[PDB]
Design a protein around this nucleic acid. Structure first.
Ligand code: MG
Ligand code: MG
Ligand code: MG
Ligand code: MG
Ligand code: MG
Ligand code: MG
Ligand code: MG
Ligand code: MG
Ligand code: MG
Ligand code: MG
Ligand code: MG
Ligand code: MG
Ligand code: MG
Ligand code: MG
Ligand code: MG
Ligand code: MG
Ligand code: MG
Ligand code: MG
Ligand code: MG
Ligand code: MG
Ligand code: MG
Ligand code: MG
Ligand code: MG
Ligand code: MG
Ligand code: MG
Ligand code: MG
Ligand code: MG
Ligand code: MG
Ligand code: MG
Ligand code: MG
Ligand code: MG
Ligand code: MG
Ligand code: MG
Ligand code: MG
Ligand code: MG
Ligand code: MG
Ligand code: MG
Ligand code: MG
Ligand code: MG
Lengths: 102, 349, 319
RNA sequence: UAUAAUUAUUAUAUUACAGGCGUUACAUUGUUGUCUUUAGUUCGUGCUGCAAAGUUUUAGAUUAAGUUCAUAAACGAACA
RNA sequence: UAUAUAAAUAAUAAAUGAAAAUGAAAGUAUUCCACCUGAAGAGUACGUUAGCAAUAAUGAAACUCAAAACAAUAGACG
RNA sequence: UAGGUAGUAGGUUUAUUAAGAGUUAAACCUAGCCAACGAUCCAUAAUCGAUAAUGAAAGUUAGAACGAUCACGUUGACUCUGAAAUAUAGUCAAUAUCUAUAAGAUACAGCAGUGAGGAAUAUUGGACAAUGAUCGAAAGAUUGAUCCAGUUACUUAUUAGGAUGAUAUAUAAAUAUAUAUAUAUAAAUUGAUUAAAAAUAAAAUCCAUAAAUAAUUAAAAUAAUGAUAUUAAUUACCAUAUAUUUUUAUAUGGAUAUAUUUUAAUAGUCCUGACUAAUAUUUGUGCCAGCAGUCGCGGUAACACAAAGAGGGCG
């Protein structure tokens, strides 16, 4: 599949998606934060290219369900900035990127 | 600190902040750090082993954990947009072991004043260093931007110079040197033609590698072809007779007396001074020469500026992490430091 | 799957087999012997290509991956040698193409497994002397020197201070031949810094990242609405990045627009000194509530974070 | 082979065991009886379920027979 | 006796769910009340209250253990 | 613990105090007051911080140590001084001990120390030199407050050696500068016959420092006063003159025949089936001896018991 990443580093915003019995609470991270997440999610991220993340798993902690849930969450739970702007008719600006611009 | 117990063991293969030949070979054969087929704890453990082996070997883990600072330092370039091209990712987590670089021990080692951080520690504790003109005996002294520190020049020459051979080692080396020189002259005198032609053949292929090219040219032009030419590196038979055999070395009477044994040695490349101990008063190999296996470890840090003319350095700033380059010098790739960083964040939980 | 693995070289090497019971050798030891080569009567491993030190301003770092572990070369011919069946050494049957062409980045990289570490450039003595003169003799600003030569302001200040030390050590005629040999040897060990070349020049547009700019923020505004760096500064409540770059350009000692006269408005009284007194007193005004030692403060003497400092003479003092 | 040498056997000893239809088919190899001339037992790729699994190996019929058709996530294959 | 609106029933989409399944809810939300925090001890002992009585309400702790429990799958068995 | 309260809730006056107030004493009324968001009663506890521990944080714990507040000085009540005492006063009551046998004295919750209790917590130490406190016009006197030292690894920090290092012999005609020195002899500890090591580990070599002895010897304190104290620190000859981040050199007078004292380095403890880092194998017992935080291991394959080799943490 294809996973959208914010600056090829982290997810867009926070995710609170539920897979069957697994409650995935994932939140974005600062540059250079590191993967401070459960080992299953850490492996999925390291293979998918995510470098900074933070989250906690609630209710069931079955490894396989966690892996399926996190892949799905990346795929559909999150939404890119461009898609939000287009469907909204508004402009979303990254303050960090525009502060360091020319 | 921790006692040096099997620092340079081959089986473990750990790389240390040292110029030692065994350490160099371990670095040579390490072939990266294996992290496949390991549970996340095992990967974290291997990373801590390797990083702690290199960075802060002498620091106790409790001290290191207290010193370890979660917040890392990085620099952002405004001119990135001016170039208008793809930018290299910033290696943020290569600055995990950057706190140790303020210490005077690491500062000396990076500045190529001591062969090892342990040697830097001993230099500091023995009163051979001065920070801003104040002599500091404590290795753990932390430095500030714009600071100066100096080391006694003799100590630096000892660190970066070859080991001084003992009396009997030098005497043996001289005896065998005379033995081989006598062979060279005898073979030159017996069949001068073949010796000269092979000497010229060696002269031809030199690849700007040794300084004997200009010596040999001066040798020839000193007495051969002062004004004549050939249509020059020409053969002469006089030098064969001019060569004189050197007297042998008893090695049993000359022992126990350096001045007496030193008057007999008259080698063309070593006159009136035994091998290595030209001036025994100095602690290093006199005349001074770089120590063996110095090339792979000679690195110029960016956070320090060094003047070997006077063994003075300036602490420009703390190491930083620019796009595509990290100022912390380490033989471990970014993932290893990532695993180590996430081990120490939770105290190894 | 974790197991203890002896750090055998990844590259192939001859492994000892049927051996005399009174040898007591190990595969690691023979690997080192193969890598180093013969040790002569002088204790020098001449064959190993890393025994010597480069004199051509190109660092000679380890390339185990590219040379497949063949570290032996003729000292003069500088051509590869490998062990044969007979136990002697000689040219390899084929030439290693990877060693033939090496990228400049790999040349400057000392450690094979870390491509983020590079060795800085040694500035020529002429460049240091020119910087010294321009700062002192010509009375220019270190900002100008940094801009022309591409160095940082801390670097140029370090250059001038070290050159002053060198001059002092020189007019005392203290520098011996050994130090000159050391400098000559190490000078040819690292590349020289060419101010003309752009890719050697160091970037001068570097800013420390404030904690707040590292935190992501997002605003939803009319698409037409233009958003610029200054608006980002307002919403992030930070000084504009260009302005911060300008500010740090003036913090240099010799840089333009520098002044440190802020602490010149405190009432300080020096007590009178009479004969025989071994000390003098300075009295500095300090407002009540802002001066003195707190009552009931924390006692970290017996804790892991105890404060340890140094005095003027350098003695370790429990601050 | 040229009275000798070598070899093979025999006899007498001894360390040394050999020997056992003694126990254990509830330790076994091999073989055999009954279910049994009974029609069952499994694998590769695909698909379904988060998964153990399932499918194929079946609605309905036919055959001595998962034999052969009809529909069907199934398409084939192996021991029968 | 075709057309529209309400209610019940039965089968479902989406959703929820550990699944079986629910499907004007066991879905999307809001408000209020009651109850649960491993098994065994135990709704037991003691106290109190009320009843003619059988009893009803309230209701512990000590000892022991890494158990205990639901849905569904594949066999074996009847 | 389901009802509690009876000066109890309130009103009016008088009395003491500087003062309001059923706070206390006296008189007359009203019939109230608390209570299932927990009264009354019972048990427990000294309380808190800009203090200590922990966590991402809200929080949770301790109340040792620094500081703040309260109560007590064997137990209970009362009284004079004062603005303030139910005072470590006194009286009285109670308890235990002692000698002087008396309306007698003491009560180590002041310092040091002793017996008991306990798994467990120190010297019957030096000085008022510094900061305070008391008396005195002052000189000064006292100060177990306080400052120091001793026991204790209870806690924290620093130090507790760097570089080099896999063998020793014998041979090598009798200064244009060479060089990949090359041959024979002997030995080679534990495990093993190669990815099975112990092991640069050891020995040996080069160079330092600690400690000792010599000189200076500040500063805590000045007018003088130093318990700590055999002070820390510096020089390894002392000091004067010159250049000068410091450092160092130049060179003069004081003692020697072209120097200027000596000099090293012996870590314990836990674990190696998984959670959990630790593959180099071998021996003993055989559901016994035993191990174990959880799963569990041991009845002849024990990676788990007891050990050797090797290894992994903390130090
Ligand atoms: Mg799991
Ligand atoms: Mg393991
Ligand atoms: Mg038998
Ligand atoms: Mg029989
Ligand atoms: Mg049978
Ligand atoms: Mg059988
Ligand atoms: Mg699936
Ligand atoms: Mg069937
Ligand atoms: Mg559905
Ligand atoms: Mg729900
Ligand atoms: Mg439910
Ligand atoms: Mg009942
Ligand atoms: Mg059990
Ligand atoms: Mg069931
Ligand atoms: Mg059946
Ligand atoms: Mg009144
Ligand atoms: Mg009253
Ligand atoms: Mg009354
Ligand atoms: Mg109550
Ligand atoms: Mg109490
Ligand atoms: Mg509290
Ligand atoms: Mg409390
Ligand atoms: Mg207290
Ligand atoms: Mg009292
Ligand atoms: Mg008492
Ligand atoms: Mg009282
Ligand atoms: Mg009394
Ligand atoms: Mg006492
Ligand atoms: Mg104790
Ligand atoms: Mg006093
Ligand atoms: Mg400690
Ligand atoms: Mg043996
Ligand atoms: Mg000393
Ligand atoms: Mg044990
Ligand atoms: Mg056994
Ligand atoms: Mg165990
Ligand atoms: Mg054992
Ligand atoms: Mg052992
Ligand atoms: Mg150990």
């Amino acid at each position: 599949k294809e996973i959208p990443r914010y600056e090829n580093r982290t997810i867009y915003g926070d995710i609170d998606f539920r897979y069957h019995g697994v409650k995935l609470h994932l939140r974005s991270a600062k540059p250079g934060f590191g993967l401070r997440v459960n080992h299953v999610i850490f492996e999925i991220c390291e293979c998918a290219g995510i470098k900074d993340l933070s989250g906690k798993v609630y209710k069931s902690r079955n490894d396989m369900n966690i892996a399926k849930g996190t892949i799905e969450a990346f795929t559909k739970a999150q939404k890119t900035l461009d898609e939000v702007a287009l469907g909204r008719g508004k402009k979303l600006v990254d303050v960090r990127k525009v502060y360091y611009s020319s | 600190p921790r006692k040096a117990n099997l620092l340079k063991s081959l089986a473990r293969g750990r790389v240390r902040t040292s110029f030692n030949k065994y350490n160099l070979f371990n670095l040579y054969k390490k072939g990266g750090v294996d992290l496949k087929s390991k549970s996340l704890y095992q990967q974290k453990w291997t990373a801590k082993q390797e990083t702690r082996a290199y960075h802060g070997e002498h620091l106790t883990e409790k001290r290191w954990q207290t010193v370890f600072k979660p917040k890392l330092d990085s620099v952002a370039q405004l001119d990135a947009s001016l170039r208008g091209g793809e930018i290299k990712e910033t290696p943020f987590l290569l600055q995990t072991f950057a706190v140790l670089e303020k210490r005077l021990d690491f500062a000396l080692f990076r500045a190529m004043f001591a062969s090892s951080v342990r040697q830097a520690r001993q230099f500091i504790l023995h009163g051979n260093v001065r920070v801003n003109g104040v002599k500091i005996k404590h290795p753990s002294y932390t430095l500030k931007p714009g600071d100066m520190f100096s080391v006694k020049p003799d100590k630096v020459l000892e660190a970066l110079g070859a080991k001084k051979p003992s009396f009997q080692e030098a005497l043996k080396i001289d005896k065998t040197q005379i033995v081989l020189w006598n062979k060279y002259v005898k073979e030159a005198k017996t069949e001068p033609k073949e010796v000269w032609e092979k000497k010229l053949e060696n002269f031809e292929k030199m690849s700007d590698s040794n300084p004997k090219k200009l010596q040999f040219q001066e040798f020839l032009r000193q007495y051969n072809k002062n004004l004549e030419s050939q249509q020059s590196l020409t053969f002469d038979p006089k030098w064969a007779k001019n060569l004189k055999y050197h007297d042998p070395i008893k090695l049993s009477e000359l022992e126990g007396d350096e001045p007496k044994a030193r008057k007999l040695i008259n080698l063309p490349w070593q006159k009136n001074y035994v091998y290595g101990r030209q001036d025994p008063k100095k602690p290093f190999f006199t005349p001074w020469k770089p120590r063996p296996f110095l090339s792979p470890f000679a690195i110029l840090p960016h956070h320090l500026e060094i003047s070997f003319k006077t063994c003075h350095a300036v602490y420009l700033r703390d190491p930083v992490a620019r796009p595509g380059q990290s100022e912390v010098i380490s033989p471990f790739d970014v993932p290893v430091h990532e695993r180590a960083y996430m081990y120490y964040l939770r105290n190894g939980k | 799957f974790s197991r203890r693995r002896i750090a055998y070289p990844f590259y192939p090497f001859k492994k000892l087999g049927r051996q005399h019971p009174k040898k007591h050798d190990t595969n690691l030891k023979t690997a080192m012997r193969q890598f180093l080569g013969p040790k002569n009567y002088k204790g020098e491993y001449v064959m190993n290509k890393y025994f010597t030190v480069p004199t051509n301003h190109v660092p000679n770092y380890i390339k185990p991956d590219l040379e497949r572990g063949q570290s032996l070369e003729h000292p003069v011919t500088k051509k590869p040698l490998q062990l044969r069946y007979d136990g002697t050494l000689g040219p390899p049957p084929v030439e290693n193409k990877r060693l033939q062409n090496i990228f400049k980045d790999r040349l400057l990289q000392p450690f094979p497994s870390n491509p983020h570490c590079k060795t800085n450039y040694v500035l020529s003595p002429q460049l240091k002397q020119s910087i010294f003169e321009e700062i002192t003799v010509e009375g220019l600003s270190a900002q100008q020197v940094s801009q022309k030569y591409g160095l940082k302001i801390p670097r140029v200040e370090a250059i001038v201070k070290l050159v002053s030390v060198e001059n002092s050590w020189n007019r005392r005629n203290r520098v011996s031949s050994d130090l000159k040999t050391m400098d000559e040897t190490l000078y040819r060990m690292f590349p020289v810094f060419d101010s003309d070349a752009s890719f050697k020049r160091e970037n001068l547009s570097e800013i420390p990242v404030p904690q707040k700019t590292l935190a992501s923020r997002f605003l939803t505004i009319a698409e037409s609405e233009p958003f610029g760096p200054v608006d980002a500064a307002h919403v992030l409540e930070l000084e504009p990045a260009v302005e911060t770059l300008r500010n740090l350009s003036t913090v240099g000692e010799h840089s333009s627009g520098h002044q440190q006269s802020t602490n010149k408005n405190t009432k300080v009284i020096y007590g009178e000194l009479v004969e025989g007194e071994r000390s003098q007193y300075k009295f500095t005004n300090a407002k009540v509530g802002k001066v003195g030692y707190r009552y009931g403060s924390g006692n970290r003497d017996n804790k892991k974070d105890r404060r340890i400092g140094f005095n003027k003479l350098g003695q370790m003092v429990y601050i």
